[PDB]
A paper describes a structure:
Using an X-ray free electron laser (XFEL), we have previously determined room-temperature (RT) serial femtosecond crystallography ([name]) structures of the ferric and Compound I redox states of [name],26 a B-type member of the dye-decolorizing peroxidase (DyP) family. Such an approach results in “pristine” [name] structures that do not exhibit the effects of X-ray-generated radiation damage. The RT-[name] [name] ferric and Compound I structures revealed that the distal heme pocket, which is composed of an Asp–Arg–Asn triad, was void of H2O molecules. [name], therefore, represents an exemplar of a His–heme-ligated peroxidase in which the distal heme pocket favors a dry site. By disrupting the distal heme pocket Asp–Asn–Arg triad in [name], our RT-[name] structures reveal that a wet site can be formed.
To assess whether disruption of the Asp–Arg–Asn triad in [name] leads to a wet distal heme pocket, microcrystals of each variant in the Fe(III)–heme state were produced and subjected to RT-[name] crystallography using a high viscosity extruder sample delivery system at the SACLA XFEL beamline BL2 EH3. For all variants, well-defined electron density peaks were present in the distal heme pocket, consistent with the presence of resident H2O molecules. In the [name] variant, three resident H2O molecules are accommodated, with two occupying the space left by the Asp152 side chain. In the [name], [name]/N245A, and R243 variants, w1 is positioned close enough to the heme–Fe(III) to be a bonding interaction (average Fe(III)–OH2 distances within the [name] hexamer assembly of 2.52, 2.83, and 2.28 Å, respectively). An obvious feature is that WT [name] displays a single pKa, as opposed to the [name] and double variants, which display two pKa values. In the [name] and double variants, H2O2 would be expected to replace w1, leaving two water molecules in the pocket, both of which participate in an extended H-bonded network, thus supporting a view that H2O dipole orientations can compensate for a proton remaining on Fe(III)–H2O2 and therefore increasing the pKa. Therefore, we conclude that by disrupting the Asp–Asn dyad, a wet distal heme pocket forms in the Fe(III)–heme state, which does not influence the efficiency of [name] reacting with H2O2, indicating that Arg243 facilitates Compound I formation in [name] regardless of whether the pocket is wet or dry.
Author numbering:
A (entry chain B), B (entry chain E), E (entry chain A), F (entry chain C): 7 to 312
C (entry chain D): 8 to 311
D (entry chain F): 7 to 313
Write the structure that this text describes.
């Protein structure tokens, strides 16, 4: 049975997201680092266990894959597709490698980031670095609980991990990232009731709005998708607030894992392009995407063997 | 007894340092915020007690004092004094207000910073914003334990709080801040034993080097100061690592509190200008100061009674 | 099939809610059942990982026939009243059980509030108990409670319906009884006399050896062996409760099993006695004031 | 300095409030129990330290004081004064002894309540027993954070503990209790902004409303009181949710400690009788007081030195 | 105010008790270590704060005091007085220095013991070393709660710290130690009710037996002492279980702190020699003392000024 | 179907290792105790759950197996093989039963050890008893992190548990124990860099030395072993510091579990007897083995069915 990366992590209150491009000639250095990244994760994290909860999920973009590896490609790997909606746009931005670093403390994330980037200096150019922090009651930058309807247990494994449909890549996953900046002033001018109509859940109690009252352009309504057999299509999300008070930057860093990118891409199409009943996701009236990238996160043993 | 701000805080693993200047006409907005800052600290922090450990210490610079208040000035308040040493320089940079925000989690620091800056928008210009994180075993960016010889209990109160020498300002303190960037590549080229000779303490065990082995230009030797009667002159420090892996920025944010700025200024003169036996503090061969400011942190009731 | 959270980690707080379904309340009940897992997530998620909030939902025999058509679970029937020579196990009404557990009573209460909010006008409350465990896992009699519960695979095999009733695989059967204790009479016994009642040492929680353990001790009467000589096991999560002002000092008994026959055989031994034991000596200090049986379906049964 | 009881406790998530009356002839049994209550607190609590945080504050009503003790009375002790407002009433109900029992866990509260009541059986009649639990984010039954503006440290000592003004009773305090039941249906029919105008603070963030927006009949405006010199008069509160979902009982148990009952009584008068600018505290349109009692909580050494 | 050592510590679950004798010629090495012991405590303990709660109380015996120091001596300092009762004996055993090391974890105790003994190698001979552990519910090796009636707060300071009666030594205390081994087989032959009559408290609930049932030769009755003016004479105890299962050694390490040794010695006399109404403390029928030593624990600043 | 003992335990900060021999005639008493050991574990441990994490792993030696049981032997069970190297020796010492007791607190370990030894008095002779404690940062007595490269999850199950190759004993494991005493004086005379060359990892950061610099006689190089198919052969280790400061005993108690003893024995041979490129493991120049024994730890159901 192939060993996945730590895509299914315990709850963590801190994260670093690192997106880089691989410079010309940097391929060999990158391959060496990939074969050591799990041993660096253990080195940094083991002595802080059990409370540290340090993990690193490593992802590779479509164009980078062809530069690094010969043989088969993962079936669903392609560049992030830009969505040019009537009002809102989901931009595509460059990224060859993702490091999704999570722990209970930002310092542990930083120590691992420092070791990873130390080995890659001269081979990569940083595109994005975000230091994320979750609020103490699992709330996001909009004041709502984040993570409630994530799948757990076997339902999570089924939703996230590549299996028999792409057997050479079993135990992998696909990550989509988007960095969002919020208009906090406009958001906080809404009443709580109007915010609940945007999200589709109660703010304080986190109870879902009933079907008869939930707006068709609420976030929860548009990101609820049923498959060909009427089962729910699910993804696993670990959105993280970030910001700078001096620069008035108040953000949500979105990351979503799925067994195939088609699930995530269908959700994004509904959000940005809308449906028969909804012009677009009302969350986008307060949130602007400034990055967008797609990565394949291979099985841990795939990385170890190169 | 006047009530001090939370200068003597429990150990915290997260901090935000905010330094701002007061714009033309911003005085009244600032005074209103100062009279509310303790109540904002309670609002953000109380529901996360007892583990949150959220506090905010507010400081006011020399020039800002005269713009905000009439009547007496604190006796020791003056602008930061630039030190132009033979090799190393301690720069002065602008700052009218300091907010030293501490907690066990960065999100609580950020929430308070957001409320404070929300009330000040349009009245202040940000000069510096640093998000600090301490390593899980109380280590700093150089890999040494940080805080070991800080005073505690009654010795700390005596060292930090203004008393009968300046009775109108009893329960206040003086804060000096400097942001340092490290040359980590050069530091990590030293052996552990060579690093220990720079600091003056063992790296793994944090035991002080004996007087016969401790170099005269070690950090602990230069920052050890005796008064006219041979008593130790002490300050309270809460130095915090910070940085950005993508920008190769690895820093220490220095903050030191003392009952009179003369103690901290004597330490800085020994570090930057040296003594008969030491050209300068060897820590400065790996650390460059890029900011420097001095603030008076009044008793909490002084702020409240505006 | 995915079970409900019958096998929970240890919790220090609980709310037990038993209700009857009023005439015309069926539809409101069915709607709540299809939402109960989503309400559990909504209340519990923001207090993770320490909250450990869960809700196990059970349905009685008479209620089942009112709510659902098609197959019944094979073992579902009303609680059987036991009229012993001295002690009686009463049957009391109950159509739905909510067994709510967490590390803190406030989280239990928040979920109970949301559940009862959705059911108002459709149900009548029969019982509500707010349970608390003592800091050293002791019960109201001063003994450690839960020691011999099965764990891991043995727990799954003992508690979850399987291939013997395949349409209801992943379900379980819950028996509840509320007991009030005579604490004055109990505390008049020596520790050694109490140990002979229970069958375990009080301070150290070591089982009394076979040569000293009385036949009418609680542990001896609730030890039952199957056709192949294996132990028949149940999973228990007994909770203290009470009111100091009313001198009410209680144990809320709940036992889960794959078939109610195991639990019912234990109860018959306790209340009716055997050739070797008049009755369970624990019953000389404990009176049952409720008794109900529920089937707790697989979580996916409720969600559909 | 005389030693207070644990009036200023760390934050606790569980409480039991026990109010009893002393039966005729029960005085001697009561006095014996009072001289042992500290030792019972240690017996129950010590083996659960450091996490248990078990404490018991013992209070004695005005009429009970006269029955138990033959010497001088605390200067501010009198029976709770009923407030008969144009709309709302603060009832006075019987109570001779208060046991305010706090810990991190309800079982530790219950163990101590059991030991106390075991010694008093036959000498007292129970009037009220409430098992309180705090919501995990310090919220009350109305969904608002409770405790935010309580004084801390030296300001709390100065506000709560009797000093030089009544030297024989230094280290004591005065407790007012009221059990409130809420109309949760009516409350949940308000918008969040309408709730915020009732309380005087933002619901989600717990930031106080500006002076320009905060209504005169908000709870925070009516319970804000300044003294003869313009200093704030403060009390220490440890309000606790309680209830029963089956009976639709959703409550707040109010307890407030103060160095003199006059501060707490002034706040209650403003709430129930109103001011020039406010008919009454709007929180009372959603909250009914069903008990009301006043107690003196003596210094610990006063209790220990008894026959 | 003179600063005491950490005689009144928060609750700790681990301890090391180290008793040594000073070898001929070892005086100078010992004096140097004493002047450094608080700085060693900070070095070992700081990086495990706030939960470590590492402290070291240092005591000096009567004969050692006269070897190390000249001039005035603490008023009550003498060698432990052997008690030769009709049945039971309290032995005096050699000991010049006590290190009473406490923390929430044994490893912190061990690290500090290692540093202390490292500085003293060649100057001292070990007489006793005990590694103590508390049971999870504060119980001792007899199964009873230990520590319940210790004084707290102000009453503890008054009972333990030397004051105006010996002003040159204000802020000190006197420690008596005795290592006890228990005859667990004999003890476990009693019923619980018979055990309770030995101790004077209920076993499970730790409620004191009422005056009408408490025997005169119970442990709590013999260790309850009133002074000529009616006040309770109290000591502070931090008894620790210890043992070795293979050697069937089950013990209690007794340590009692008091402002004068007269209080502790009066308790010991009542235990071992008895009263008019009690032949001896019944706890001694199941407990044998194998060490006995007395130490003065000076104010912290006395040690620092060497 | 078979239920293993708790070989794969969560991390624990305390342990007791008890090794006994079975006296002539003690076999029946031992068999009775083995059938009850799981129920004693529950009795002691249940009331401290969920934080106690008390477990006991029971092992049986080769000669004891033949005295206790008839029918099949586990295929790999034999007495520990003495290794007589040119410089260093791995001695074989007597041991019939191992009790490897772990918990979050030493109290719980001690209570269970007391109950076990209580049942076996008169049937067994203690050979070794060690009370282990972890340093707060997972460090050993040499100052290095211990446990970093242990297998986890499925890789741990595959490495440790007997399966289809010995089907009657599926769910069992083999334990090798050695008690080591260190020469701490000689070790602390090395520079940190010289220590790192002994171990094969960086001291402070726990990063493995790269292949070009790692010495062939480093500990990590000699204990890295590849199988016939090029896979890494792994074991699960739960080494625990122990000691006595007064006797200058500073130790590491080695325990290693594996599905077959040949893996552990190949590592030992490389350490003690060396390779073409390394005379012996350099860790042995600072570490002396004073015990050595091998045990089979059966499935839990094997013990219960006695
Ligand atoms: C007043 C009610 C009760 C009290 C206070 C109580 C208490 C206890 C205690 C202290 C134990 C020993 C520790 C443990 O394993 O939990 C025990 C064991 C047990 N109890 Fe009860 N119990 C009660 C009622 C019941 C009822 C009604 C049943 C069955 C229908 C039951 C079945 C069991 C079983 C099966 C055991 C495990 C026996 C064994 O060691 O195999 N109990 N109970
Ligand atoms: C139904 C009963 C009550 C509820 C639900 C309630 C709730 C609250 C809330 C949510 C706050 C704001 C947060 C805080 O500082 O705790 C508050 C503040 C306060 N309450 Fe109440 N309360 C009640 C009864 C009372 C009573 C009866 C009194 C006085 C006799 C009182 C005195 C106060 C005071 C002095 C404050 C702080 C006001 C300020 O200075 O900011 N409360 N209460
Ligand atoms: C022999 C081993 C010892 C054991 C196992 C032991 C055990 C206990 C226990 C279980 C208690 C009751 C709970 C408490 O308040 O701590 C206690 C109380 C006490 N013990 Fe001991 N003890 C021992 C030796 C000593 C010695 C040698 C002294 C005095 C020299 C002493 C002085 C006290 C005192 C003063 C109390 C408090 C009595 C009261 O005022 O209530 N103990 N001890
Ligand atoms: C003096 C006794 C010992 C000490 C202080 C010691 C210490 C260590 C240290 C510090 C590590 C590096 C971090 C890690 O745990 O992975 C290590 C790794 C290891 N040790 Fe030891 N050890 C000792 C004895 C043994 C023995 C006797 C064996 C085998 C029989 C052994 C097998 C291993 C293995 C397999 C590894 C992992 C190597 C790798 O794949 O990276 N050790 N040891
Ligand atoms: Mg009978
Ligand atoms: Mg014996």
């Amino acid at each position: 049975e192939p060993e996945p990366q730590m895509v299914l992590s315990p709850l963590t209150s801190a994260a670093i997201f690192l997106v880089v491009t691989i410079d010309s000639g940097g391929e060999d250095t990158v391959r060496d680092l990939l074969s050591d990244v799990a041993s660096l994760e253990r080195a940094v994290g083991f002595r802080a266990q059990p409370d540290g909860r340090l993990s690193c999920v490593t992802g590779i973009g479509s164009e980078a894959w062809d530069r690094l590896f010969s043989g088969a490609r993962p079936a669903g790997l392609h560049p992030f597709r830009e969505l040019d909606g009537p009002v809102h746009r989901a931009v595509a931005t460059p990224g060859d490698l993702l490091f999704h670093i999570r722990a209970s403390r930002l310092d542990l994330c930083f120590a691992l980031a420092t070791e990873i980037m130390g080995r890659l200096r001269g081979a990569v150019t940083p595109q994005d670095e975000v230091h994320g922090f979750k609020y103490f009651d699992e709330r996001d930058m909009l004041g709502f609980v984040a993570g409630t309807e994530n799948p757990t247990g076997a339902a999570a494994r089924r939703a996230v991990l590549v299996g028999a449909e792409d057997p050479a890549f079993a135990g992998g996953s696909y990550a989509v990232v988007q960095k969002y900046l919020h208009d906090i002033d406009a958001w906080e001018g809404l009443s709580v009731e109007a915010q609940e109509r945007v999200i589709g859940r109660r703010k304080m109690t986190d109870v879902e709005l009933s079907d008869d009252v939930k707006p068709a352009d609420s976030h929860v309504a548009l990101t609820s998708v049923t498959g060909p057999d009427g089962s729910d299509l699910e993804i696993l999300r670990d959105n993280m607030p970030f910001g700078s008070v001096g620069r008035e930057e108040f953000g949500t860093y979105f990351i979503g894992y799925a067994r195939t990118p088609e699930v995530t891409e269908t959700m994004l199409e509904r959000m940005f392009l809308g449906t028969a009943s909804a012009p677009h996701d009302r969350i986008l009236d307060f949130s602007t995407a400034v990055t967008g990238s797609l990565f394949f996160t291979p099985a841990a043993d795939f990385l170890e063997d190169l």
